[PDB]
Amino acid sequence: DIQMTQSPSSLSASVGDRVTITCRASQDVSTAVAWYQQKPGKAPKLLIYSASFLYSGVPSRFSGSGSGTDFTLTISSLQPEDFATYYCQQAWAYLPTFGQGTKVEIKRTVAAPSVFIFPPSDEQLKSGTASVVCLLNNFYPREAKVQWKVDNALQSGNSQESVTEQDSKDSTYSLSSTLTLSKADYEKHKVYACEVTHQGLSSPVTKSFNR
């Protein structure tokens, strides 16, 4: 059964660059190779079939080539929309097989995060536990520290972070950090601070509140 092997498995590049990604069938597969594009949380879309034919609606910046066992997909001028994982398939054997995928991230200039803090809404306070959320909006690159501080005291890994994939328009990231505490813990204290550190910020920014 025919194995497909893609390279590189991930890469990053700047809007405007000419990107090229590679695919090797483990046996002669003629020109029966297709390429699909998968954007985050969406179903994949066909780009190219029979090695070099563009599918309807696919912009002319995409193109493909090869035969036998070596196939390449080129983007001639990467756009932010093109952030996605790209897969080759062989359409030669009785059983289709896909390559392992190539993740294409985007490089861009440093962008500073907008920070917002969120207190727990009464509705929740009723249920016992309490969730304070810290929002870092639209920054780049992805590296960023978010230290919580309860009464000026550095807190543990009882916080949780989540990050978004790169935005398809501005290529930035967003991040949420949530700290969960009990009735007894949240009620008993007053000073709750979120301190964000990030390359694009000249100095640490702090957002905080009281009950």
Partner: protein, 541 residues
């Protein structure tokens, strides 16, 4: 010599030159009398013994004008033997001009006139304080001249935002003490003042109201926030186009396209809605950004734009860079002899980042497209940082007003107003007595008013356009004892670089030293003479 500017805190006389001897023929004087703050007024009282040539005041006369400069309202134009009546200012300044072309002349007394209006002016120390037009939320009183000042400790930025603002009548914000520090904006509409962050130490508002029909007024609020930049810190941070810290107000252009769909406010890097396009494509159009404070500029990033209506790509292929500390005196960035042309974009979506080889200290920036494809369309980011982002590097108060006139001394003037020596604030500059003096002999001196650690200075030229090219620096705790900063290579006093332009300032750093008094000694300079404005950088012990 006759003429001059007089503080009315002291009552004083002003007379025609030789009074009561007949005044000189064919010679004109002019004085400005002024009160400490807009709250007070000035009254003039002429002596009854008054003699100017008659005819119909065609030749000799005294003119008094309401406010300042020759274009202010004519309070009165007099001659013959009957002295003017008492004259009272509508503001806190009068302008007087005696003109001559025989007769004993005139004499007057001046002093401050007091209206009885309040001293509503509040200072602010508090971390979380608020400020508003007195009487708020109800209507604001008539005839109000009020100053609200926020003072801040060493490493703490003042944040100032506005909740409502509706209002002849005006509010203006100052990067320091009012009418000394630079103006940052005069507001008087329905549009609220955009947020302000400031690392100066001082920020002040000036509220002015009239007799006629008050509006809803204004309410605002301020925070002081600590800022510790690192050691490992590089001055390449984005300044606020994409993030919005540079607010819409701050962005402006030479002109904009007719349909209103390509405004200055759309020139933000990565904006989803077209970009800025001028009314007509040529190389004399510009987009401008007012950073509001003196900022280091280290890089520019630019983009084209794709029309949302028609999907057509437009982009600037090359541009020039004009900077200015005041919005009036401009300098085109240079690469050796001639203007530097930056290579910009080659499609409508890539970002192309140009690092200045020479970091620039400035306030206003202008991008001027030179070539383009299909049309001029820009989106833009600026990168840099503030002077105060380096350890112990605070502006010690020439720019702001925190170092009073009475703390600035000069070897020799050709006049005097010490406020003319101030970095940026000043509208002229310090000139010596003999413009083309001898090197190492003329000097300019600041009294910091306390022992400080001094880490550098910022030198600027003067507007008669001239500027220092090289200088030495000396310092003292006392006033009579003086060490020069030494080059450990030559073991002679170190020769610093001055300016290459009369407006665009330059920052020189040196090893930390103790000093309450600092001096700067011009060594080489420009043709026109020794022009100089100045500021000193350091901190407390």
């Amino acid at each position: 010599p006759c003429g001059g500017r007089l503080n009315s805190k002291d009552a004083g006389y002003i007379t025609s030159p030789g009074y009561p001897q007949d005044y000189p023929s064919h010679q004109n004087c002019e004085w400005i009398v002024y009160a400490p703050e807009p709250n007070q007024k000035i009254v003039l009282n002429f002596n009854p013994h008054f003699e100017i040539e008659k005819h119909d005041c065609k030749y000799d006369f005294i003119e008094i004008r309401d406010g300042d400069s020759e274009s202010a309202d004519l309070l009165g134009k007099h001659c013959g033997n009957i002295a003017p009546p008492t004259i009272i200012s509508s503001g806190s300044m009068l302008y007087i001009k005696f003109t001559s072309d025989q007769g004993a002349g005139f004499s007057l007394r001046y002093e401050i006139f007091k209206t009885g209006s309040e001293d509503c002016s509040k200072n602010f120390t508090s971390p979380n304080g608020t400020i508003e037009s007195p009487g708020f939320p109800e209507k604001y009183p008539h005839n109000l001249d009020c100053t609200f000042t926020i003072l801040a400790k060493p490493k703490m930025e003042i944040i100032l935002q506005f909740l409502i603002f509706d209002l002849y009548d005006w509010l203006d914000i100052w990067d320091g003490i009012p009418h000394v520090g630079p103006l940052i904006g005069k507001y008087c509409g329905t549009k609220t003042p955009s947020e302000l962050r400031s690392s100066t130490g001082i920020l002040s508002l000036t509220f002015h109201t009239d007799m006629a029909v008050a509006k809803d007024g204004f309410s605002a609020r301020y925070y002081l926030v600590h800022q510790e930049p690192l050691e490992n810190f590089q001055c390449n941070v984005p300044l606020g186009m994409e993030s919005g810290r540079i607010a819409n107000e701050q962005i402006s252009a030479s002109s904009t396209y007719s349909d209103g769909r390509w405004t200055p406010q759309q020139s933000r890097l990565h904006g989803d809605d077209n970009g800025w396009t001028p009314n007509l494509d040529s190389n004399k159009e510009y987009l401008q950004v007012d950073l509001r404070f003196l900022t280091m500029l280290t890089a520019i990033a630019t983009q084209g734009a794709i029309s949302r209506e028609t999907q057509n790509g437009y982009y600037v292929k090359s541009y020039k860079l004009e900077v200015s500390t005041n919005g009036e005196d401009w300098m085109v960035y240079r690469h050796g002899k001639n203007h530097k042309v930056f290579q910009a974009n080659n499609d409508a979506t890539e970002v192309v980042l140009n690092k200045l080889h020479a970091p620039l200290l400035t306030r206003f920036v202008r991008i001027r497209p030179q070539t383009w494809h299909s049309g001029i369309a820009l989106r833009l980011e600026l990168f840099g940082c503030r002077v105060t982002d380096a350890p112990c590097s605070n502006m010690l108060g020439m720019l702001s007003g925190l170092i009073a006139d009475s703390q600035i001394s000069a070897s020799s003037t050709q006049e005097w107003s010490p406020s003319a020596a101030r970095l940026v604030s000043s509208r002229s500059g310090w000139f010596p007595r003999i413009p083309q003096a001898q090197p190492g002999e003329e000097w300019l001196q600041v009294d910091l008013g306390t022992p400080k650690t001094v880490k550098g200075v910022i030198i600027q030229g003067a507007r008669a356009r001239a500027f220092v090219r090289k200088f030495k620096v000396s310092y003292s705790l006392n006033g009579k004892d003086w060490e020069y900063i030494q080059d450990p290579r030559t073991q002679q006093p170190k020769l610093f670089e001055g300016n290459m332009h009369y407006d665009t300032p330059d920052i020189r750093r040196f090893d930390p030293i103790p000093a309450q008094y600092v001096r700067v000694y011009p060594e080489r300079w420009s043709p026109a003479g020794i022009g100089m404005r100045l500021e000193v950088l350091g901190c407390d012990w």
